[PDB]
Amino acid sequence: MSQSNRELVVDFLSYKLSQKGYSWSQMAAVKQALREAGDEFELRYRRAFSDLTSQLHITPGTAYQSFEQVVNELFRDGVNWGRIVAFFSFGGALCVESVDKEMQVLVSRIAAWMATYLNDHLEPWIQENGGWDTFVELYGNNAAAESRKGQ
Amino acid sequence: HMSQSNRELVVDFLSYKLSQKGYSWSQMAAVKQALREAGDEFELRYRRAFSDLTSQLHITPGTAYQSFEQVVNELFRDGVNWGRIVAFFSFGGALCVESVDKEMQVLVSRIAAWMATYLNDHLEPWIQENGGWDTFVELYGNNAAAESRKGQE
Amino acid sequence: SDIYKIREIADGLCL
Amino acid sequence: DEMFSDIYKIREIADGLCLEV
Amino acid sequence: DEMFSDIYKIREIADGLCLEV
Amino acid sequence: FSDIYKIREIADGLCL
Amino acid sequence: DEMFSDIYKIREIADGLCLEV
Amino acid sequence: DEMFSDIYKIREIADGLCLE
Ligand code: NA
Ligand code: NA
């Protein structure tokens, strides 16, 4: 037996049940909503200006500052859902740049930095503003994209 | 001190994003996303040709596996192809939705096991001899089936 | 045509 | 919509949502 | 604190994979 | 790195 | 046989989560 | 495109893809 066969099935069923409206932990719902919100943010940014990863620049020694620098700049005025989505997309952009420049060792580090910032500085705001549950209700089912396409 | 979910959400998003931009190593992320997209496309085509997939599905605890086996055996009765493999996943998902709707939620993990078992025993050998999951990603990745459909209307 | 319908859509989905 | 109600306990939910391996 | 404590509970309870619904 | 105010602007417009 | 053997290899190697790319 | 070149060993791949 291949555990990948189990993993593939479980992922599909989680995706499908959550998509059809059912929820319990809402883990699948949040993940899917983030994937969608991330795509929508990057689309809007790429149309407004250039692509996100186009202007990034880092080295293993200068990777961390360039991260905290941008992130703390993003949230100095405060926190909202849009910025949290942008936080994920920037982290993704940083990883794409790292791989493109063959500094793949930075990927798991960037991931750790994101998780740490999310945990230390974003989670308190999220819990006081309805938790991930509110994010799902607002941004689930590709809501941000549907708002744009309506116009 | 650290919520594990904060790690899990970040890892999921980054896996999704890196695979989306074209990079691959194990291709686990690519296969999952391609299956998600293909399932949606199959169900879209099925629903726009007939009624919804979950519309007619009869299930009881005593005959659940038996019914599952019969349907899947007739599906691959005269062979396997990538389209039927996608249909296989969609049918299982439809079976789960009906199970939950009929307050038989406990059957969800059972259906998951039956699928994994059939996938492993009867679908995996064909997949390996037909280019592996790598071929499926190349053919169906980036929502290729959907793109094909209405490069045509 | 339950399974026939599934097989038809499936084979049409082939790329 | 809720997949389980307040009736279900954590082990009952685990049995239904998780595979036996 | 952990906002998905439930899914991590059923995961430890179980020996196999859990759905993330 | 002044692109951060560009990121922030698109992010705020994304809000629902 | 396991078609994603490599990703399971690095999962045991590590203490925590691995990207699935 | 391949994320890692053929020179990479599975040890360093784990370091780059996995947390901690
Ligand atoms: Na996953
Ligand atoms: Na590491």
Numbering used by the authors:
A (entry chain B): 1 to 26, 83 to 207
B (entry chain A): 0 to 26, 83 to 208
C (entry chain C): 15 to 29
D (entry chain E), E (entry chain G), G (entry chain H): 11 to 31
F (entry chain D): 14 to 29
H (entry chain F): 11 to 30
Lines from the paper:
To provide structural details of the TCTP/Bcl-xL interaction, the crystal structure of a deletion variant of Bcl-xL (Bcl-xLΔ27–81ΔTM) in complex with TCTP11–31 has been solved and refined at 2.1 Å. This crystal structure revealed that upon binding to Bcl-xL, the residues 16–27 of TCTP11–31 completely refold into a 3 turn α-helix conformation that binds to the BH3-binding pocket of Bcl-xL, a hydrophobic groove created by helices α2-α5 of Bcl-xL. In unbound TCTP17, this N-terminal region stabilizes the β-sheet hydrophobic core of the entire TCTP protein. This suggests that the interaction between the full size Bcl-xL and TCTP proteins induces a substantial reorganization of the known TCTP fold. Three additional residues, I17, L29 and the side chain of K19 participate in this hydrophobic packing. Furthermore several hydrogen bonds and two salt bridge interactions contribute to the recognition process: (i) R21 of TCTP BH3 domain interacts with E129 and D133 in Bcl-xL; and (ii) D25, part of the (Gly/Ala)-Asp motif between the h3 (P3) and h4 (P4) positions of BH3 domain, interacts with R139 in Bcl-xL.
Translationally Controlled Tumor Protein (TCTP/tpt1) is a regulator of pluripotency, the cancer stem cell compartment, the tumor reversion program, tumor progression and certain forms of inflammatory diseases.
